[PDB]
Amino acid sequence: AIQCPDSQFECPDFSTCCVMVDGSWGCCPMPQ
């Protein structure tokens, strides 16, 4: 569970900190 700048939330070890096309941040599942 690490943080990520330009964001107001955090992400767990289940998903990394990524972004979307809309313009908002979010934790996306790591590429397996």
Side-chain angles (χ1 to χ4, degrees):
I2 17 159
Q3 267 123 310
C4 21
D6 297 62
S7 157
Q8 254 197 241
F9 15 81
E10 309 149 56
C11 293
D13 244 80
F14 265 71
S15 291
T16 176
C17 220
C18 237
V19 311
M20 328 143 70
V21 198
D22 210 281
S24 217
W25 274 80
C27 318
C28 217
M30 256 224 205
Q32 225 155 59

